[PDB]
Paper text:
Artemis is phosphorylated by DNA-PKcs and acts to open DNA hairpin intermediates generated during V(D)J and class-switch recombination. Artemis belongs to a superfamily of nucleases containing metallo-β-lactamase (MBL) and β-CASP (CPSF-Artemis-SNM1-Pso2) domains.
The overall architecture of the three variants is almost identical to WT Artemis. The D37A structure crystallizes with only one nickel ion (M1); Both the H33A and H35D variants exhibited loss of the M1 ion. By contrast, all three variants retained the Zn ion in the zinc finger-like motif of the β-CASP domain. Mutation of Asp37 to alanine results in the loss of the second metal in the catalytic site, likely explaining the loss of activity, although the first metal ion is still present. By contrast the D37A variant has similar thermal stability as the WT Artemis, suggesting that it is folded in the presence of a single metal ion in the active site. Our D37A, H33A, and H35D variants lost the ability to digest DNA substrate in vitro, in accord with results with full-length variants. Thus, whilst our results support the importance of having both metals for the nuclease activity by Artemis, subtle features can influence MBL fold enzyme activity.
Residue numbers in the entry: 3 to 361
Amino acid sequence: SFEGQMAEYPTISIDRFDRENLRARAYFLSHCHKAHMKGLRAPTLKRRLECSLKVYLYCSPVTKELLLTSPKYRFWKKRIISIEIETPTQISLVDEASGEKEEIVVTLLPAGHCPGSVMFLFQGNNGTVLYTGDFRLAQGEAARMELLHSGGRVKDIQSVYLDTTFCDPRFYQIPSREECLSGVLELVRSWITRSPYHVVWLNCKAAYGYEYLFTNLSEELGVQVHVNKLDMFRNMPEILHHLTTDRNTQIHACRHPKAEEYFQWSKLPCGITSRNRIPLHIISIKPSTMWFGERSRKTNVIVRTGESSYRACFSFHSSYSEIKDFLSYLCPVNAYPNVIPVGTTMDKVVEILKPLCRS
Ligand code: NI
Ligand SMILES: [Zn+2]
C-alpha cells in the first residue's frame, strides 16, 4: 500500500509524514483529511524541521488555508508553499547529508474529493508520475484536463498511484454528484417547506467534503446550515455564509458523540427540541455511499430507513467503472493502488488494473 513514497521520486513524500518520510527533501499534502495527515504534526517531524531549513510543504491554496486554521499545524506556516491549480511549477530539492540537487515540475489537478483536494502530476528526469490522492472524477473530466496531455494525446505516464477505495466490480456504478445533490435537495425541500418547525438533521462524518451539499441546500432553500464550527472557512465567503453556529435553523449538520441516541428521542445533536413550545418535526438524512452492479440499473438515491430517517447517496470516491475509465485513459506503464478495499486483497486490485497498463 501507499506509505508516502513513489518509486520514481523517493526523495519526496506525499500524504504520509512518519517513518521513512522523515528524510523527505519536500512534502506534499493532497487534501486535509486525517487519513492523509499521519505524522504531519509529530514531535519527530518538528524536530527534523528545526534541523533541515530548505524543506517545504506544498499543497493547494485551499488546503493551506484549511490546514493552518488548526492551531496544532500553525508551525508549518513558515514552510508551506501553495501552488496554484493547473499551473506547472518548478521545485528544487536539495540533499541535507549529500551535496545533491534535484529538479521536478509539479502540476496540481482538481480531485473532486473535498475543498482543496488535488492530484499531483510530477515531471522530472525519471519519468512522469501521477499521484491522485483521494479522487472522484466523472467520465470525460480527465480528457478535459489539458495538462494531462501533450500534442493531443495523454502524456506518457510511467506510474499512477491511485485511489482504489471502490476498485472492485461490485461497486460498478455510483450515482453522479448532481443526482445525489438533487435527491437530497428535494427531500429537504419537501420537509422544511411544511412549516417553520420541520427541520432536517444531516448526519455527516467529521471531515471536509460535505460543504458543496451544504452550500447547494443553503443556496436553493434560503436557509443556513447549523454546524459545530465554521472558523476554518473564515476566509472562504462562498462556503462561510451558508453556515451558522446558531441552533435556530431548519437545516442542521451539527455533531455529537451520542447524536444517534438523541435523534431516536426526537432531539437533534445541538439540543434544540422545540420552538414556541411546539416540538420540532425532525428527519435524519445520512449521506452514505450507494452503488449498483454492472448488470443492474440505478435505483432511488434516497433510501427510507424509518418513519423519520433516510440514507442519501453520496460518494467521496470514484466507482469501479470510473476508476477503470480513468486508468484506461491514462494508459500508464504501472498502476499502484493507494488503498485496498475492505473485502478484497492487493493481488485482486492489482490484477483488476493490470490489463489497462502497458507493462
Ligand atoms: Ni480523503
Ligand atoms: Zn444543530
